[PDB]
Write an enzyme that holds these catalytic residues in place. Structure first.
Site, PDB file in Angstrom:
ATOM      1  N   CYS A  74       1.535  -2.583  -3.699  1.00  0.00           N
ATOM      2  CA  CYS A  74       1.986  -2.102  -4.982  1.00  0.00           C
ATOM      3  C   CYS A  74       1.503  -2.945  -6.166  1.00  0.00           C
ATOM      4  O   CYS A  74       1.873  -4.105  -6.311  1.00  0.00           O
ATOM      5  CB  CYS A  74       3.526  -1.934  -5.060  1.00  0.00           C
ATOM      6  SG  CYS A  74       4.023  -1.105  -6.613  1.00  0.00           S
ATOM      7  N   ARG A 108       4.427  -4.121  -9.381  1.00  0.00           N
ATOM      8  CA  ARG A 108       5.611  -4.958  -9.137  1.00  0.00           C
ATOM      9  C   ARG A 108       6.165  -5.764 -10.317  1.00  0.00           C
ATOM     10  O   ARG A 108       7.281  -6.202 -10.235  1.00  0.00           O
ATOM     11  CB  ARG A 108       5.432  -5.818  -7.887  1.00  0.00           C
ATOM     12  CG  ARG A 108       5.467  -4.993  -6.614  1.00  0.00           C
ATOM     13  CD  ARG A 108       5.072  -5.791  -5.381  1.00  0.00           C
ATOM     14  NE  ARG A 108       3.611  -5.983  -5.148  1.00  0.00           N
ATOM     15  CZ  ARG A 108       3.144  -6.936  -4.319  1.00  0.00           C
ATOM     16  NH1 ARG A 108       3.993  -7.759  -3.703  1.00  0.00           N
ATOM     17  NH2 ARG A 108       1.843  -7.086  -4.084  1.00  0.00           N
ATOM     18  N   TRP A 145       5.963   5.625 -12.197  1.00  0.00           N
ATOM     19  CA  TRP A 145       5.039   6.358 -13.021  1.00  0.00           C
ATOM     20  C   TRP A 145       3.612   6.193 -12.458  1.00  0.00           C
ATOM     21  O   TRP A 145       3.370   5.352 -11.639  1.00  0.00           O
ATOM     22  CB  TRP A 145       5.179   6.032 -14.547  1.00  0.00           C
ATOM     23  CG  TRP A 145       5.053   4.581 -14.943  1.00  0.00           C
ATOM     24  CD1 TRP A 145       3.890   3.851 -15.027  1.00  0.00           C
ATOM     25  CD2 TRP A 145       6.120   3.678 -15.311  1.00  0.00           C
ATOM     26  NE1 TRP A 145       4.175   2.554 -15.411  1.00  0.00           N
ATOM     27  CE2 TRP A 145       5.527   2.419 -15.594  1.00  0.00           C
ATOM     28  CE3 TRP A 145       7.522   3.809 -15.421  1.00  0.00           C
ATOM     29  CZ2 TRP A 145       6.289   1.287 -16.001  1.00  0.00           C
ATOM     30  CZ3 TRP A 145       8.281   2.694 -15.818  1.00  0.00           C
ATOM     31  CH2 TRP A 145       7.657   1.448 -16.107  1.00  0.00           C
ATOM     32  N   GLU A 186      -5.068   7.121 -10.014  1.00  0.00           N
ATOM     33  CA  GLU A 186      -4.526   7.840  -8.860  1.00  0.00           C
ATOM     34  C   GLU A 186      -4.811   9.344  -8.998  1.00  0.00           C
ATOM     35  O   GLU A 186      -5.167  10.004  -7.997  1.00  0.00           O
ATOM     36  CB  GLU A 186      -3.006   7.622  -8.772  1.00  0.00           C
ATOM     37  CG  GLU A 186      -2.554   6.168  -8.624  1.00  0.00           C
ATOM     38  CD  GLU A 186      -1.052   6.080  -8.433  1.00  0.00           C
ATOM     39  OE1 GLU A 186      -0.558   6.566  -7.381  1.00  0.00           O
ATOM     40  OE2 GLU A 186      -0.363   5.533  -9.333  1.00  0.00           O
TER      41      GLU A 186
HETATM   42  C1  HEM Z   1       6.707   1.370 -12.197  1.00  0.00           C
HETATM   43  C2  HEM Z   1       5.476   1.857 -12.032  1.00  0.00           C
HETATM   44  C3  HEM Z   1       4.694   1.739 -10.759  1.00  0.00           C
HETATM   45  C4  HEM Z   1       3.333   1.847 -10.640  1.00  0.00           C
HETATM   46  C5  HEM Z   1       2.399   2.045 -11.807  1.00  0.00           C
HETATM   47  C6  HEM Z   1       2.995   1.673  -9.254  1.00  0.00           C
HETATM   48  C7  HEM Z   1       1.694   1.697  -8.756  1.00  0.00           C
HETATM   49  C8  HEM Z   1       1.388   1.798  -7.405  1.00  0.00           C
HETATM   50  C9  HEM Z   1       0.142   2.233  -6.904  1.00  0.00           C
HETATM   51  C10 HEM Z   1      -1.074   2.675  -7.705  1.00  0.00           C
HETATM   52  C11 HEM Z   1       0.227   2.184  -5.548  1.00  0.00           C
HETATM   53  C12 HEM Z   1      -0.863   2.586  -4.599  1.00  0.00           C
HETATM   54  C13 HEM Z   1      -0.543   4.053  -4.285  1.00  0.00           C
HETATM   55  C14 HEM Z   1      -1.656   4.852  -3.642  1.00  0.00           C
HETATM   56  O1  HEM Z   1      -2.851   4.522  -3.815  1.00  0.00           O
HETATM   57  O2  HEM Z   1      -1.371   5.858  -2.936  1.00  0.00           O
HETATM   58  C15 HEM Z   1       1.516   1.718  -5.200  1.00  0.00           C
HETATM   59  C16 HEM Z   1       1.924   1.514  -3.905  1.00  0.00           C
HETATM   60  C17 HEM Z   1       3.287   1.351  -3.682  1.00  0.00           C
HETATM   61  N1  HEM Z   1       4.299   1.179  -4.600  1.00  0.00           N
HETATM   62 FE1  HEM Z   1       4.212   1.263  -6.499  1.00  0.00          FE
HETATM   63  N2  HEM Z   1       4.111   1.430  -8.560  1.00  0.00           N
HETATM   64  C18 HEM Z   1       5.187   1.530  -9.382  1.00  0.00           C
HETATM   65  C19 HEM Z   1       6.549   1.423  -9.070  1.00  0.00           C
HETATM   66  C20 HEM Z   1       7.031   1.423  -7.765  1.00  0.00           C
HETATM   67  C21 HEM Z   1       8.366   1.654  -7.390  1.00  0.00           C
HETATM   68  C22 HEM Z   1       9.561   1.978  -8.251  1.00  0.00           C
HETATM   69  C23 HEM Z   1       8.409   1.523  -6.035  1.00  0.00           C
HETATM   70  C24 HEM Z   1       9.612   1.703  -5.199  1.00  0.00           C
HETATM   71  C25 HEM Z   1      10.818   1.383  -5.641  1.00  0.00           C
HETATM   72  C26 HEM Z   1       7.092   1.225  -5.592  1.00  0.00           C
HETATM   73  C27 HEM Z   1       6.735   1.006  -4.299  1.00  0.00           C
HETATM   74  C28 HEM Z   1       5.418   1.125  -3.859  1.00  0.00           C
HETATM   75  C29 HEM Z   1       5.119   1.106  -2.417  1.00  0.00           C
HETATM   76  C30 HEM Z   1       6.106   0.994  -1.269  1.00  0.00           C
HETATM   77  C31 HEM Z   1       3.791   1.224  -2.293  1.00  0.00           C
HETATM   78  C32 HEM Z   1       3.032   1.260  -0.971  1.00  0.00           C
HETATM   79  C33 HEM Z   1       2.716   2.670  -0.404  1.00  0.00           C
HETATM   80  C34 HEM Z   1       2.041   2.587   0.965  1.00  0.00           C
HETATM   81  O3  HEM Z   1       2.076   1.539   1.663  1.00  0.00           O
HETATM   82  O4  HEM Z   1       1.429   3.587   1.418  1.00  0.00           O
HETATM   83  N3  HEM Z   1       6.280   1.148  -6.660  1.00  0.00           N
HETATM   84  N4  HEM Z   1       2.218   1.438  -6.361  1.00  0.00           N
HETATM   85  N1  LIG Z   2      -0.266  11.545   6.804  1.00  0.00           N
HETATM   86  C1  LIG Z   2      -0.778  10.964   7.890  1.00  0.00           C
HETATM   87  N2  LIG Z   2      -0.891   9.619   7.929  1.00  0.00           N
HETATM   88  C2  LIG Z   2      -0.124   8.807   7.134  1.00  0.00           C
HETATM   89  C3  LIG Z   2       1.159   8.423   7.561  1.00  0.00           C
HETATM   90  C4  LIG Z   2       1.962   7.604   6.762  1.00  0.00           C
HETATM   91  C5  LIG Z   2       1.479   7.161   5.526  1.00  0.00           C
HETATM   92  C6  LIG Z   2       0.199   7.528   5.069  1.00  0.00           C
HETATM   93  O1  LIG Z   2      -0.291   7.100   3.838  1.00  0.00           O
HETATM   94  C7  LIG Z   2       0.517   6.653   2.720  1.00  0.00           C
HETATM   95  C8  LIG Z   2      -0.401   6.173   1.598  1.00  0.00           C
HETATM   96  N3  LIG Z   2       0.092   6.769   0.369  1.00  0.00           N
HETATM   97  C9  LIG Z   2       1.033   7.841   0.603  1.00  0.00           C
HETATM   98  C10 LIG Z   2       2.210   7.775  -0.372  1.00  0.00           C
HETATM   99  O2  LIG Z   2       2.208   6.547  -1.115  1.00  0.00           O
HETATM  100  C11 LIG Z   2       2.191   6.431  -2.498  1.00  0.00           C
HETATM  101  C12 LIG Z   2       1.716   7.468  -3.287  1.00  0.00           C
HETATM  102  C13 LIG Z   2       1.699   7.376  -4.664  1.00  0.00           C
HETATM  103  C14 LIG Z   2       2.155   6.224  -5.298  1.00  0.00           C
HETATM  104  N4  LIG Z   2       2.024   6.170  -6.645  1.00  0.00           N
HETATM  105  C15 LIG Z   2       2.896   5.782  -7.553  1.00  0.00           C
HETATM  106  N5  LIG Z   2       2.466   5.480  -8.708  1.00  0.00           N
HETATM  107  C16 LIG Z   2       4.349   5.741  -7.205  1.00  0.00           C
HETATM  108  C17 LIG Z   2       5.107   6.491  -6.310  1.00  0.00           C
HETATM  109  C18 LIG Z   2       6.420   6.068  -6.343  1.00  0.00           C
HETATM  110  C19 LIG Z   2       6.755   5.001  -7.197  1.00  0.00           C
HETATM  111  S1  LIG Z   2       5.313   4.513  -8.003  1.00  0.00           S
HETATM  112  C20 LIG Z   2       2.610   5.148  -4.512  1.00  0.00           C
HETATM  113  C21 LIG Z   2       2.639   5.253  -3.112  1.00  0.00           C
HETATM  114  C22 LIG Z   2       1.451   7.696   2.071  1.00  0.00           C
HETATM  115  C23 LIG Z   2      -0.597   8.353   5.886  1.00  0.00           C
HETATM  116  C24 LIG Z   2      -1.205  11.877   9.012  1.00  0.00           C
HETATM  117  C25 LIG Z   2      -2.394  12.562   9.323  1.00  0.00           C
HETATM  118  C26 LIG Z   2      -2.306  13.336  10.494  1.00  0.00           C
HETATM  119  C27 LIG Z   2      -1.061  13.309  11.148  1.00  0.00           C
HETATM  120  S2  LIG Z   2      -0.012  12.270  10.221  1.00  0.00           S
END
Ligand code: HEM
Ligand SMILES: N=C(Nc1cccc(O[C@H]2CN[C@H](COc3ccc(/N=C(/N)c4cccs4)cc3)C2)c1)c1cccs1
Ligand code: HEM
Ligand SMILES: N=C(Nc1cccc(O[C@H]2CN[C@H](COc3ccc(/N=C(/N)c4cccs4)cc3)C2)c1)c1cccs1
Ligand SMILES: C[C@H](O)[C@H](O)[C@H]1CNc2nc(N)[nH]c(=O)c2N1
Ligand SMILES: C[C@H](O)[C@H](O)[C@H]1CNc2nc(N)[nH]c(=O)c2N1
Ligand SMILES: [Zn+2]
Lengths: 405, 403
Positions: B107, B110, B279, B284
């Site tokens: 993330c 943070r 947000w 993204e």
């Molecule tokens: C406040 C504005 C925030 C921004 C701009 C932001 C930005 C991001 C971005 C760009 C990613 C990568 C997502 C992707 O490529 O799919 C990410 C991952 C993540 N963020 Fe945030 N974030 C924010 C707030 C939060 C909040 C509120 C949470 C939860 C309370 C959070 C938890 C996470 C988590 C758990 C991931 C990892 C997802 C994974 O492992 O697949 N973030 N964040």
């Molecule tokens: N879907 C599959 N694999 C799989 C399983 C678990 C997770 C995954 O990827 C993550 C990466 N990414 C996804 C969501 O994470 C996000 C997405 C957006 C995001 N962006 C933000 N700005 C925020 C969201 C919420 C607060 S900030 C932050 C985190 C979810 C892929 C399968 C293929 C075939 C069978 S299963």
């Protein structure tokens, strides 16, 4: 099912298993508690024998002769030689195979589609600093080849017990001077500040331009290094203009054609070649993104954006991204116009995906350092971004080595 | 031996000592690094995690070692011994959720971690109740475009029964409609969830940007379908500040990114439905969602509109279109007055966060491949910054799909 790292491509959905990592003899910087993969610097007796045996086995496989009598005699030869001398020596064809295998083994190189095509100059007869200079000039002439660049390596004598090392002090055969100022800033390339000051302490008369080619500091065993000026006509450079922005040429930017790393150690079968400079050609983002736009390098992003009349007072105008693109396009265009080999980050990475597929069939895997393989602009626009990678160390290898001073 | 962490632009060096507190293994071993991989390769158990988490809580409120603390530890102990599980107080839950976000290595947002609205939905007994809670969350987090970070936490896993789950991977997702000729209409990442919805009774549309219903599931019951009322889902039409033809591509994106398939682990307890939102970072939408080859993949169309040479990689047409598309996204979100952050401001603030975390905790777990944006990497400061990746608890995790 399979007990080896599962490797996924998230663009195409395809899976592979790396079985080559099994062949890693040498540990990297990671443990189950923490991942140190993003760190740039990953912080004999019978020992030599087993590295040697392993390398000779790799050689016999590459010629399809494992188990043969030629194979088992070579092993016996190698241990006999260590037995009485403490070290041993490589056949010519062994050195050539090992050099290609070291390039092939390098996790940070995106150019490995080319690995089988490497001119190996054998320079293990070299006995003075003057002679290194001759070999180096020959290398540059051949590799440069008036703009149609050819991959090459020149191998100088291995390290040897007691006797001092062969060393090229400069990190590349071609390097621009970095002159520290009174106002604390730097003229030229800040990366080369230290090698610049060494060149001066050793009697070089410094220029004062932004693009002064440095002399070479060459060191032969147990001797102070000596200074050699490259004849300017050997050092091909490219002036930088942009295909449509007419003013870009007025910036007086330039870069040299031949990238040639001179400070890395080539290790084969335990033997250690401390002077073994190698060259290929550039990927355009090396010049246009890193060397010209790193804040700690030429740092020209702001100057270019001002000429392009961008709003440099706010991040959200993407002035940085727009300027960087144009600089990259200028590099590509100017090399094209000058007929100097260069490759763009799209061609490069597409060819690396092919390389990965070749190596999957041939060795069952390919060691690769994702943070380095992915280009520094337009990352997810390239197919490597979406490809998982397993990073590990195989031998023969190119390694970092401490600086001689 | 602790890791030296170097920034290569400023030549400064830290040591990460926070990693010593990691209790879980990552995918790497000495023989090979696996960091670019996306997916992961008894009472005394729960009891240690519980003690350790209760210890984190009392320390944070600086009421450590003493009376309220020692008694809270006995309560947890008494409850595990008799029931094999325990329950968290609301304020503990609140501490845990913020700390899980704080600890997420992927993330880049943070810096914000202390500012999180936490809705306790542990008193939820039906899909219907999950729907109402999900709507309040959307309504609160959206806030007419002045977005506010939030999490809603549903009832934890229990040994006896199946999980509360949201089948959808985000609360807002566009339909993906597979064609008989392989090709996809809409968002190819959402083909399987689109199909699941229809199978459970939803009437499909045929647009490129049709908003999905939610599939909500109370334990051991078939999932239930719920349509989000269109006025709850704020969307932004995409136009470009100077290229008038761009608007005509009819592109848009939704304002609220809210992840809804991850598991929240606090104190050894697991929360299988705990959607969270903040947000967007512009890259993204602009780079990944619209330009990935396996997403809406609009790069060629934009390039042809801008009249570029498509025939050759070396005209950098892809790089040029990407930049305009990201520009369109920032401009469009700015105009609609909806919170967005660009990748330069985002990474700059993450640098400030690493620094805060260094002073506060002696390190910061971070995942370099995910922190560095997908365009203009080395143009942001994070590219130049070494990073150590490891798992701390509380944490957000992946869990299997419920179907
Ligand atoms: C406040 C504005 C925030 C921004 C701009 C932001 C930005 C991001 C971005 C760009 C990613 C990568 C997502 C992707 O490529 O799919 C990410 C991952 C993540 N963020 Fe945030 N974030 C924010 C707030 C939060 C909040 C509120 C949470 C939860 C309370 C959070 C938890 C996470 C988590 C758990 C991931 C990892 C997802 C994974 O492992 O697949 N973030 N964040
Ligand atoms: N879907 C599959 N694999 C799989 C399983 C678990 C997770 C995954 O990827 C993550 C990466 N990414 C996804 C969501 O994470 C996000 C997405 C957006 C995001 N962006 C933000 N700005 C925020 C969201 C919420 C607060 S900030 C932050 C985190 C979810 C892929 C399968 C293929 C075939 C069978 S299963
Ligand atoms: C054929 C054209 C080639 C291209 C385009 C190319 C491209 C690259 C690039 C872009 C890098 C990363 C550079 C950086 O960020 O500093 C690299 C690393 C490297 N390449 Fe190549 N390469 C080529 C040929 C070669 C050759 C001929 C060798 C040696 C025989 C070689 C060995 C290496 C090694 C050892 C590294 C990594 C150095 C380190 O770990 O710090 N490559 N390659
Ligand atoms: N700092 C120094 N020593 C030093 C010590 C350890 C490591 C180190 O860096 C390596 C990694 N990074 C650096 C260059 O590696 C490269 C550079 C360019 C490159 N690009 C190419 N296209 C090719 C070069 C050769 C064949 S293709 C491929 C690899 C070289 C430098 C010194 C500075 C001045 C005198 S000593
Ligand atoms: C911190 C990080 O490891 C460092 O900036 C790396 C990232 N990726 C790189 N990739 C290449 N090809 N060359 C580099 O110098 C770097 N620098
Ligand atoms: C294989 C590679 O790890 C994968 O493509 C990752 C790279 N970095 C990423 N970084 C972010 N923020 N989001 C992603 O989906 C990915 N994908
Ligand atoms: Zn690792």
């Amino acid at each position: 099912g399979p007990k080896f790292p599962r490797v996924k491509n998230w663009e195409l959905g395809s899976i592979t298993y790396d079985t080559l990592c099994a062949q890693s003899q040498q540990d990297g910087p990671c443990t189950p508690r923490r991942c140190l993969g993003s760190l740039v610097l990953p912080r004999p007796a019978e020992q030599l024998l087993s590295q040697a045996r392993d390398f000779i086995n790799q050689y016999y496989s590459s010629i399809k002769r494992s188990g043969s009598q030629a194979h088992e005699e070579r092993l016996q030869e190698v241990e006999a030689e260590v037995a009485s001398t403490g070290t041993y020596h490589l056949r010519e064809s062994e050195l050539v195979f090992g050099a290609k295998q070291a390039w092939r083994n390098a996790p940070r190189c995106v150019g490995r589609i080319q690995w089988g095509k490497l001119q190996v100059f054998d320079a293990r007869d070299c006995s003075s600093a003057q002679e290194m200079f001759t070999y180096i000039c020959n290398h540059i002439k051949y590799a440069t080849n008036r703009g149609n660049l050819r991959s090459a390596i020149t191998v100088f004598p291995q390290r040897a017990p007691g006797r001092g090392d062969f060393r090229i002090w400069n990190s590349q055969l071609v390097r621009y001077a970095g002159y520290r100022q009174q106002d604390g800033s730097v003229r030229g390339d800040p990366a080369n500040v230290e090698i610049t000051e060494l060149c001066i302490q050793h009697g070089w008369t410094p220029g004062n331009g932004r693009f002064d080619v440095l002399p070479l500091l060459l060191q032969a065993p147990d001797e102070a290094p000596e200074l050699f000026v490259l004849p300017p006509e050997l050092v091909l450079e490219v002036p930088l203009e942009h295909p449509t922005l007419e003013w870009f040429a007025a910036l007086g930017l330039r870069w040299y054609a031949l990238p040639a790393v001179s400070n890395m150690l080539l290790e084969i079968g335990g033997l250690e070649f401390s002077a073994a400079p190698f060259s290929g050609w550039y990927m355009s983002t090396e010049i246009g993104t890193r060397n010209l736009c790193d804040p700690h390098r030429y740092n020209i992003l702001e100057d270019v954006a001002v000429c392009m009349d961008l709003d440099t007072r706010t991040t959200s105008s993407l002035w940085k991204d727009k300027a960087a693109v144009e600089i990259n396009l200028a590099v590509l265009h100017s090399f094209q116009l000058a007929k100097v080999t260069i490759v763009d980050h799209h061609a490069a990475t597409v060819s690396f995906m092919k390389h990965l597929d070749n190596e999957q069939k041939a060795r069952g895997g390919c060691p690769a350092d994702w943070a380095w393989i992915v280009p520094p602009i337009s990352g997810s626009l390239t197919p490597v971004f979406h490809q998982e990678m397993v990073n590990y160390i195989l031998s023969p290898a190119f390694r970092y080595q401490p600086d001689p001073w």
